[PDB]
Structure formats: structure tokens, C-alpha cells
């Protein structure tokens, strides 16, 4: 069924599971560099060169 | 300074030595100017009152939903305020009572409550001779409205 109005084409909950697991996997890698990053460190430029 | 003796171009008769006879509080000039200005300001918004009601700007809607009184039901003559419910007329002069004591207190005999002239929410301050000139116009149009009401309420 393709003309039915499903959120992101999710008609089975398998597809919802792989959307979460796919997006959380790169998030967890990305949190390996940008987790443990200080929230109160600001800057007054157009661009920040903070850390890695 | 709106309490000077130089506004209304002069002059009239009595000076009323009966006022200082045994009621000496009412013999003060500053209060008689505060009364004449206040009787003028009330009279001026009363002629526009008998211009708006008499042109049948009635209102959109009901005045009292439970008494079933719409705004087109109250008369246009001088029996307008004595035809609304007294539960409604009580709210009118209750709000005047907060005006008469708290917001624009009539014990302030100057009459200047810091409002300017033509601009609400930010006062239009008049500075020089035109400030001097608009004060007597307030009295002089206040006097024409005082005599205009008793010409429009005997008949």
C-alpha cells in the first residue's frame, strides 16, 4: 500500500526500529567526539575552532 | 503651572465673600479653579455623550445578558444612566471612584495628572506660550460646554 498516509512510509514496526538504530549508531560515534563537550564555552566570531 | 490667575482673559463679577463667611475651606481660589476645570472636563465629555447617543450609535450586542437588555433599548435622552441596571451603574461610578481617588485624584487641585494633551501612553508635553495658551482653551471650551448642557437639558 503506497498511497496510504504513513509517517515516513512506516507501515511495519521493523522500519521504525531500523530508523532509530541507524540514526542512533552514527549519533553514538558522533558523541564520541562531541559528548563530554562543555556547554558554557562560547565564542564571539562567525565560526568556532574549539577542539576535536 | 495650571493654577495661575492669567488663563481665562478676565473678568467677572462677585469674588464671593459669602464663601469665607463660615465655610472658609471653599473660599480658596485654587479649589475654585480646580472645580471650574473639573466641571469643564466633565461637561465636555457629556456633550459628545449626547452627540453619540443621539446619533444612535447604539452598540453591537447586549448590555445585560440575563436581564435581556440590549444597547438599543436604553434611551437617548437624559434618562440614559437611570435606565441601565443599578448593578451596571454601580460599576460605572465605582470605576470613577478609583479615578477620583487613585489614578486622577481630585485632591490634586492642579488637574495635571501627567498625561500630556493629545498623545496616550506617552505624554505630549507642551512647553512655552502654547502650553500657556492651551490651558485657557481647556477652560474656555470647558465653559461653553457647561452652559451648553443646561441649554440642552431643559428641553
Amino acid at each position: 500500500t503506497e498511497g496510504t498516509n504513513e509517517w515516513f512510509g512506516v507501515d511495519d514496526l521493523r522500519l521504525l526500529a531500523v530508523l532509530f538504530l541507524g540514526h542512533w549508531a552514527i549519533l553514538s560515534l558522533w558523541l564520541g567526539s562531541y559528548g563530554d563537550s562543555n556547554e558554557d564555552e562560547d565564542f564571539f566570531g562567525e565560526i568556532d575552532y574549539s577542539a576535536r | 503651572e495650571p493654577l495661575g490667575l492669567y488663563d481665562p482673559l478676565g473678568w467677572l463679577d462677585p469674588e464671593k465673600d459669602p464663601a469665607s463667611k463660615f465655610a472658609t475651606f471653599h473660599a480658596n481660589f485654587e479649589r475654585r479653579r480646580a472645580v471650574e476645570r473639573k466641571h469643564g472636563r466633565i461637561a465636555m465629555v457629556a456633550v459628545v455623550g449626547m452627540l453619540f447617543h443621539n446619533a444612535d450609535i447604539e452598540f453591537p450586542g447586549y448590555l445585560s445578558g440575563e436581564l435581556g437588555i440590549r444597547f438599543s433599548d436604553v434611551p437617548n435622552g437624559m434618562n440614559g444612566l437611570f435606565s441601565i441596571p443599578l448593578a451596571g451603574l454601580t460599576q460605572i461610578v465605582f470605576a470613577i471612584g478609583v479615578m477620583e481617588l487613585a489614578i486622577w485624584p481630585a485632591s490634586n487641585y492642579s488637574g495635571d495628572y501627567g498625561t500630556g494633551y493629545g498623545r496616550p501612553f506617552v505624554p505630549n508635553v507642551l512647553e512655552g506660550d502654547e502650553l500657556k495658551y492651551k490651558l485657557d482653551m481647556e477652560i474656555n471650551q470647558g465653559r461653553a460646554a457647561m452652559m451648553g448642557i443646561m441649554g440642552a437639558l431643559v428641553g
Binding site: 500500500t1 496510504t4 498516509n5 507501515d11 | -
Partner: protein, 227 residues
């Protein structure tokens, strides 16, 4: 001549929660969780421990330990009452006898579940809430002026009850105090909304959210009839 609180609005330091409003001088910065939020000026008129008698009715100057005492267990009760407003609707209810009556513990509207469960259920909850408040007063009669607000002698430091070890570092402990206070202030707002929605809807919150996070029965597609 002047008020003792009119001079606290005369100094009137810069605020953080209301950064346009100039918080009064009685918020010194030295208290946990002070973000300069006192627009009505209650910290300028500090309260004392009135429950100890008439000699404790006065409040000392510049001491908000009893405002913080009332803040902490308004929020500690509120936190455990988010879950009380939610968990019967989520994790089911309890069964009843013929004595208590069947469906006594089963009212999923949490407000009339007060008026449905037996009185001995509420009386024993109230007496257990009473017992730890007897424990509170006995702590404030011993400690007196060296009484820390929110202390029921549960945890890390001196001769308190610690069945879990809980031996935090001395400044990870002040982060736990700030995590408690920020959850205290948040769940006070949260349990107000739960109490107000349970009146306004008539049902529990899982029963109002779950009905709004579901598709309507006239809108539900018939669905998946393709062989």
C-alpha cells in the same frame, strides 16, 4: 523609618531568572539554586520555624533555611507524586477483596481513586507520612541552628542512615543537591499539571496521552488488503 525590605530593593542586584527585573539584595548568591528569582520579595521577609512554638515563630534576618525547607519537601513530595499520578495508569492497579470491595484500587482517574480506596489505606499512608515528619521535628529539635534544610539524616555524611554506601565526592555531592532542587522545582509544576488535567479530562494521564497519541477510529486506514 523605611521598611527592612525596602532597603533590600534599594540595593537590588542583577538577576538571572528574571534578567530585566533586578532581584533583591537578600538573594546573596551563597544559597544552592539561587538564580535571582524573587519578584514578589519573599526572601526579604524571611520566615522562622514556627512549628517549634512561639519562640520559633520569628524569622532571623537573612536566613532562608525555612523557605528552603518548605521548598525541598514540597518538591520531594511532588516528585514522588508525578509517579503516583502516572504509575497506576501505566503499570496497572492492585486487586481488592470483598472486604475492601473489588474495583476499590482500580479507579484509573487518580483523584476519585482517593474517594474509592478504603479509609484504612489512606490512614496508613498518612501515618507513615506522619512518622517521617516526627523524625523530621526530632532532627530539628536536636540540630536547631545547625540544621541543614532537607536533612532527614539519609545518606552520605555523618551519623545518617546509609544502607547503600552512597559515598559521593564532596563536590559531586553538591551537584546531587542541585539535581534534587531542579527536579523539585520541575515536578512541582509537573504535579500541578497532572492534578489539573485529571480534573479537566476526568481520566488518568496515560488515558489522555494514549488517546491523543493514537489515530482516531474514523481516521484509521483499513490497511493492508493487498495480496
Amino acid at each position: 523609618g523605611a521598611s527592612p525590605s525596602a532597603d533590600a530593593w534599594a540595593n537590588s542586584i542583577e538577576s538571572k531568572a528574571l534578567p530585566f527585573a533586578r532581584a533583591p539584595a537578600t538573594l546573596d548568591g551563597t544559597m544552592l539554586g539561587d538564580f535571582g528569582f524573587d519578584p514578589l520579595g519573599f526572601s526579604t521577609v524571611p520566615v522562622g520555624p514556627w512549628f517549634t512554638g512561639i519562640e520559633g515563630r520569628n524569622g532571623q534576618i537573612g536566613n532562608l533555611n525555612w523557605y528552603r525547607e518548605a521548598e525541598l519537601i514540597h518538591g520531594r513530595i511532588a516528585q514522588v507524586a508525578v509517579v503516583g499520578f502516572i504509575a497506576p495508569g501505566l503499570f496497572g492497579t492492585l486487586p481488592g477483596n470483598e472486604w475492601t470491595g473489588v474495583d476499590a484500587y482500580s479507579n484509573l482517574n487518580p483523584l476519585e481513586a482517593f474517594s474509592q480506596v478504603p479509609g484504612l489505606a489512606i490512614l496508613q499512608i498518612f501515618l507513615f507520612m506522619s512518622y517521617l515528619e516526627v523524625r523530621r521535628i526530632n532532627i530539628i529539635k536536636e540540630e536547631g541552628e545547625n540544621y541543614m534544610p532537607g536533612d532527614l539524616r539519609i545518606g552520605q555524611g555523618e551519623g545518617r542512615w546509609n544502607p547503600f554506601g552512597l559515598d559521593y565526592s564532596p563536590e559531586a555531592y553538591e551537584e546531587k543537591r542541585l539535581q534534587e532542587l531542579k527536579h523539585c522545582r520541575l515536578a512541582m509544576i509537573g504535579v500541578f499539571g497532572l492534578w489539573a488535567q485529571a480534573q479537566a479530562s476526568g481520566v488518568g494521564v496515560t488515558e489522555q496521552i494514549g488517546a491523543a497519541l493514537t489515530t482516531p477510529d474514523y481516521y484509521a486506514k483499513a490497511g493492508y488488503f493487498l495480496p
